[PDB]
Design an enzyme around this catalytic site. Sequence first.
Site, PDB file in Angstrom:
ATOM      1  N   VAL A  27      -7.941  -4.929   7.370  1.00  0.00           N
ATOM      2  CA  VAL A  27      -6.385  -5.262   8.125  1.00  0.00           C
ATOM      3  C   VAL A  27      -5.412  -4.106   8.035  1.00  0.00           C
ATOM      4  O   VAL A  27      -4.898  -3.855   8.822  1.00  0.00           O
ATOM      5  CB  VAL A  27      -5.804  -5.597   6.840  1.00  0.00           C
ATOM      6  CG1 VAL A  27      -6.100  -6.900   6.466  1.00  0.00           C
ATOM      7  CG2 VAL A  27      -5.164  -4.992   5.333  1.00  0.00           C
ATOM      8  N   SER A  29      -5.636   1.065   9.369  1.00  0.00           N
ATOM      9  CA  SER A  29      -6.148   2.440   8.748  1.00  0.00           C
ATOM     10  C   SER A  29      -5.670   3.105   7.536  1.00  0.00           C
ATOM     11  O   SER A  29      -6.051   3.522   7.073  1.00  0.00           O
ATOM     12  CB  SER A  29      -4.593   2.737  10.256  1.00  0.00           C
ATOM     13  OG  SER A  29      -5.351   2.579  10.858  1.00  0.00           O
ATOM     14  N   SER A  30      -8.191   3.150   4.454  1.00  0.00           N
ATOM     15  CA  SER A  30      -8.112   2.291   5.073  1.00  0.00           C
ATOM     16  C   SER A  30      -8.295   0.839   4.237  1.00  0.00           C
ATOM     17  O   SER A  30      -8.975   0.864   2.829  1.00  0.00           O
ATOM     18  CB  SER A  30      -9.236   1.885   6.004  1.00  0.00           C
ATOM     19  OG  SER A  30     -10.134   1.920   5.597  1.00  0.00           O
ATOM     20  N   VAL A  31      -7.598  -0.325   4.592  1.00  0.00           N
ATOM     21  CA  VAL A  31      -7.389  -1.035   3.592  1.00  0.00           C
ATOM     22  C   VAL A  31      -7.979  -2.166   4.163  1.00  0.00           C
ATOM     23  O   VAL A  31      -8.343  -2.872   5.381  1.00  0.00           O
ATOM     24  CB  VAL A  31      -6.105  -2.038   3.671  1.00  0.00           C
ATOM     25  CG1 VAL A  31      -5.907  -2.371   2.405  1.00  0.00           C
ATOM     26  CG2 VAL A  31      -4.930  -0.063   3.086  1.00  0.00           C
ATOM     27  N   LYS A  46      -8.989  -1.110  -0.746  1.00  0.00           N
ATOM     28  CA  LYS A  46      -8.665   0.595  -0.382  1.00  0.00           C
ATOM     29  C   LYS A  46      -9.486   1.514  -0.380  1.00  0.00           C
ATOM     30  O   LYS A  46      -9.299   2.241  -1.095  1.00  0.00           O
ATOM     31  CB  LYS A  46      -7.643   1.421  -0.264  1.00  0.00           C
ATOM     32  CG  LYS A  46      -6.961   2.960   0.104  1.00  0.00           C
ATOM     33  CD  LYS A  46      -5.554   3.221  -0.673  1.00  0.00           C
ATOM     34  CE  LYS A  46      -4.449   2.826   0.362  1.00  0.00           C
ATOM     35  NZ  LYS A  46      -3.307   3.149   0.740  1.00  0.00           N
ATOM     36  N   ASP A 161       2.999   0.784  -1.098  1.00  0.00           N
ATOM     37  CA  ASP A 161       3.265   2.296  -0.037  1.00  0.00           C
ATOM     38  C   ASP A 161       2.023   2.767   0.954  1.00  0.00           C
ATOM     39  O   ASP A 161       1.756   3.026   0.473  1.00  0.00           O
ATOM     40  CB  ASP A 161       4.285   3.612  -0.109  1.00  0.00           C
ATOM     41  CG  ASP A 161       4.518   4.782   0.172  1.00  0.00           C
ATOM     42  OD1 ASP A 161       4.792   5.587   0.328  1.00  0.00           O
ATOM     43  OD2 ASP A 161       3.862   4.700   2.006  1.00  0.00           O
TER      44      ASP A 161
HETATM   45  C1  LIG Z   1      -0.103   9.664  -2.255  1.00  0.00           C
HETATM   46  C2  LIG Z   1       0.727   8.512  -1.899  1.00  0.00           C
HETATM   47  C3  LIG Z   1       1.112   8.366  -3.956  1.00  0.00           C
HETATM   48  C4  LIG Z   1       1.623   6.719  -3.935  1.00  0.00           C
HETATM   49  C5  LIG Z   1       1.830   5.770  -2.819  1.00  0.00           C
HETATM   50  N1  LIG Z   1       2.681   4.906  -3.988  1.00  0.00           N
HETATM   51  N2  LIG Z   1       3.406   4.657  -3.962  1.00  0.00           N
HETATM   52  C6  LIG Z   1       3.669   3.435  -4.549  1.00  0.00           C
HETATM   53  C7  LIG Z   1       5.335   2.819  -4.695  1.00  0.00           C
HETATM   54  C8  LIG Z   1       4.575   3.028  -6.358  1.00  0.00           C
HETATM   55  C9  LIG Z   1       5.223   1.779  -4.310  1.00  0.00           C
HETATM   56  C10 LIG Z   1       6.234   3.750  -5.105  1.00  0.00           C
HETATM   57  C11 LIG Z   1       2.968   3.066  -4.442  1.00  0.00           C
HETATM   58  C12 LIG Z   1       1.619   3.555  -3.965  1.00  0.00           C
HETATM   59  N3  LIG Z   1      -0.012   3.282  -3.250  1.00  0.00           N
HETATM   60  C13 LIG Z   1      -0.023   1.892  -2.704  1.00  0.00           C
HETATM   61  O1  LIG Z   1       1.054   1.267  -2.818  1.00  0.00           O
HETATM   62  N4  LIG Z   1      -1.285   1.830  -1.906  1.00  0.00           N
HETATM   63  C14 LIG Z   1      -1.498   0.849  -2.459  1.00  0.00           C
HETATM   64  N5  LIG Z   1      -2.560   0.680  -2.045  1.00  0.00           N
HETATM   65  C15 LIG Z   1      -3.604  -0.565  -1.695  1.00  0.00           C
HETATM   66  C16 LIG Z   1      -2.739  -1.553  -1.147  1.00  0.00           C
HETATM   67  S1  LIG Z   1      -1.233  -1.010  -1.198  1.00  0.00           S
HETATM   68  C17 LIG Z   1       1.385   6.112  -2.226  1.00  0.00           C
HETATM   69  C18 LIG Z   1       0.731   7.004  -1.646  1.00  0.00           C
END
Ligand SMILES: Cc1ccc(-n2nc(C(C)(C)C)cc2NC(=O)Nc2nccs2)cc1
Length: 333
Positions: A27, A29, A30-31, A46, A161
């Site tokens: 879906v 860039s 990877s998920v 991911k 995020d």
């Molecule tokens: C380096 C770094 C650290 C933290 C995050 N954050 N922070 C959040 C908050 C909890 C919304 C702030 C969520 C995420 N990550 C996230 O959603 N990951 C996903 N994986 C699969 C589908 S969505 C992202 C990158």
Amino acid sequence: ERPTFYRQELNKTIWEVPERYQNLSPVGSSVCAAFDTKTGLRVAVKKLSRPFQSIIHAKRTYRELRLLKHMKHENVIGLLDVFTPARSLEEFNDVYLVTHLMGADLNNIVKSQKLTDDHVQFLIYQILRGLKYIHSADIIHRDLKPSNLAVNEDSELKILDFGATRWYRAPEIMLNWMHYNQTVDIWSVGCIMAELLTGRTLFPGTDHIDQLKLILRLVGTPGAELLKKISSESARNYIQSLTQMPKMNFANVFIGANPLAVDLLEKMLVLDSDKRITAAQALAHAYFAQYHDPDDEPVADPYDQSLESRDLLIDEWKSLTYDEVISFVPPPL
Ligand SMILES: Cc1ccc(-n2nc(C(C)(C)C)cc2NC(=O)Nc2nccs2)cc1
Ligand SMILES: CCCCCCCCO[C@@H]1O[C@H](CO)[C@@H](O)[C@H](O)[C@H]1O
């Protein structure tokens, strides 16, 4: 026991996941979207890109895992699972994260058409309820926007995020001010709300400066109280050196909207970030009257930033990440 892993070639690279996860389809860039046979849920998987190649990749990996492992709230994304093909630390070199696949981001639902006030009410209430939680842990999102908001068929919302996007940034981030407080996410929400109500982008800047010009045009220039907080001299003198813009009255921008929406917009999109409404406060605004429940707007256990701002060796971040993988308890479903 250990699960059984099956191998596959998805998006220019080899993915190895438990048989439990099926229909694996990319879906972004990877998920990969996938269907989880053990639960019946639709999941996002991911695969971390070279998680332990650099100090920064390792640090990034440990941060994301730790943060989601602590995130347990209905309007924030949460870990359904985390796994590796590895059977030992020595062979540990790939990290996978599983979450709910809500269905769409907040672009698919809007598709550039005016949503009804009742629909806005419900979405923004969900965002804010989730923000109160994120902020109580002392975490600032910093990059709120519709692509980072996961929504299902029934408009249920989770903040996530996926590490123009500039259209929702608080002016201070753009201006590389270094002390940020939680209300940067509040600026983004204001910009998001506005977009759902009027149907178009609030500040559709073409570049960095254009983005700022459009902001100043709506909220006006800094008043005397705000000039007083500018740490720089040239910047201080530059701001004075302009056509003083009078703060536009939002009721003349959002014509025929709920006046409660307008009032809330006035309170979110204040230039001086110390005068913006907090998430907790916003939840209590009359605009969410039909949804607001002060006994069901939970806060987070306290969260340690510093352990992320460390300088360790690669092998340490990797071992710390491995432990995190090994200690994982899935949420009962
Ligand atoms: C380096 C770094 C650290 C933290 C995050 N954050 N922070 C959040 C908050 C909890 C919304 C702030 C969520 C995420 N990550 C996230 O959603 N990951 C996903 N994986 C699969 C589908 S969505 C992202 C990158
Ligand atoms: C050029 C016009 C845009 C500048 C206005 C942005 C000011 C944002 O507001 C500021 O946020 C700071 C950073 O968190 C706070 O420390 C300040 O107290 C607050 O005034």
